[PDB]
């Protein structure tokens, strides 16, 4: 952070800019997690303190729901775990606080223990976070109050809570600044607050990428950065068309991106590719299928939580065949359902069906995503681990090297992950 500084970026608020050149691959800075939380569905597979994935984790003797590398990771996490250790025993199977509430809880506990500036807040402090309180509508304030109620519902026996109005601000700050920690396959590991990483503004053609070493965020260049140039990360999945991207960005972050990808709309034509029929859909018919695809995407998202895998496959297959009458296979909405179908096949342990989908996805993914995308890398890595599991070694190693080649740039040549994948080779 010596060759970097915060500044006022016109029309963007505060931001981060380079004071020195950065080549592709260079580490700009690392940031320790101010607060972090392991997701519920990853309990028992990951250490809750350092996010180290290993076997043979020690259960928390009292709750039997927290797992640790050892006694040191148990004792070091205790200040954060004590917000949950007893409520998990008492509430039983009705302890259902959302991951946001869980994270927000740890934030307040951290402010009690370490009220002064942490190694996480060298350039931007948690108290200094943007909240967009002034922009919040009814539904957003309503979701915040539901989170505040659940915070006192499950945590009152443990944490010092400020007034309602400070918690509105904090929850708003969390939504604006928070990060999801993802693994190598871009699966949801947990949620964290990285104050210094939160200083960076968004772009759909970013010059940096955020990766994780346990609970430690690392920021590496994916484009050449010059002195005086602002550093942009990306807040969202960049597969989708400009309208889709900015609907998500206005919704969650209260801004419209004006990057070169959003200005030119360069990739939209290929992203929403229409087939070459003698009777091609009208602009209205295209509009209607696109409106349908985005509604199906949202429905499948909420359907994922409860519907059976075979039911989930069905809607993926139904969506595809309907859209395939006007959309090409490299169309992004086709790719979405293909990706979701691939994931269901993986849970079903249909390794052959999963590999089939992955093969249809990889080439269009390389086209739509920017260079050094971990979206592309993890798809290669999924393909690779599928070829290897099915004893197809030439195709497996080739795909895994494609993954490693990107991950060296994004993760750094000697990240624990790359040596994990090299062992597979």
């Amino acid at each position: 952070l010596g060759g970097l500084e915060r500044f006022c970026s016109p029309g963007k608020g505060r931001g981060l800019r380079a004071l020195q050149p950065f080549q592709v691959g260079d580490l700009l800075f690392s940031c320790p997690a101010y607060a972090y939380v392991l997701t519920v569905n990853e309990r028992g597979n990951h250490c809750e303190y350092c996010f180290t994935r290993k076997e043979g984790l020690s259960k928390c003797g009292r709750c039997k729901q927290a797992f640790y590398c050892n006694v040191e990771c148990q004792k070091e996490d205790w200040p954060m775990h004590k917000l949950e250790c007893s409520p998990m025993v008492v509430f039983g199977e009705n302890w259902n606080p959302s991951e946001t509430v869980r994270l927000t809880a740890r934030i307040l506990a951290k402010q009690k223990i370490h009220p002064e500036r942490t190694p996480s807040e060298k350039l931007l402090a948690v108290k200094e976070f943007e909240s967009h309180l002034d922009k919040l509508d009814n539904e957003k304030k309503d979701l915040i109050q539901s989170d505040i109620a659940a915070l006192h519902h499950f945590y009152s026996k443990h944490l010092g809570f400020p007034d309602n109005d400070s918690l509105v601000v904090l929850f708003a700050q969390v939504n604006c600044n928070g990060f999801t920690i993802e693994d190598e396959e871009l699966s949801h590991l947990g949620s964290a607050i990285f104050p210094d990483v939160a200083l960076m503004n968004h772009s759909c053609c970013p010059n940096v990428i955020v990766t994780y070493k346990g609970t430690l965020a690392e920021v590496r260049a994916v484009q050449e950065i010059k002195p005086g140039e602002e550093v942009f990360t990306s807040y969202i999945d960049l597969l989708y068309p400009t309208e889709d991207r900015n609907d998500r960005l206005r919704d969650s972050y209260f801004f419209t991106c004006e990057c070169q990808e959003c200005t030119t709309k360069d990739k939209d034509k290929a992203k929403v590719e229409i087939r070459k029929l003698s009777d091609p859909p009208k602009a209205e018919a295209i509009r209607d299928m696109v409106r349908y695809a985005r509604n199906v995407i949202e429905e499948f998202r909420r359907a994922k939580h409860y519907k059976s895998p075979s039911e989930l496959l069905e809607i993926c297959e139904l969506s595809q065949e309907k859209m395939s009458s006007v959309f090409e296979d490299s169309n992004v909405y086709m790719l979405h359902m293909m990706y979701q179908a691939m994931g269901v096949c993986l849970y079903m342990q249909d390794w052959e069906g999963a590999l089939q989908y992955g093969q249809k996805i990889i080439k269009p993914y390389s086209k739509h995503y920017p260079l050094y995308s971990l979206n592309v890398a993890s798809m290669w890595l999924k393909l690779g681990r599928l070829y290897m599991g099915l004893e197809h070694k030439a195709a497996g190693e080739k795909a895994l090297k494609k993954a490693i080649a990107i991950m060296e740039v994004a993760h750094g040549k000697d990240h624990p992950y790359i040596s994990e994948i090299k062992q597979e080779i």
Binding site: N175, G178, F179, T180, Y235, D237, Q340, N375, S378
Partner: peptide
């Protein structure tokens, strides 16, 4: 939701 590369 929170900042991520995926989450379809």
């Amino acid at each position: 939701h929170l900042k991520s590369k995926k989450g379809q």
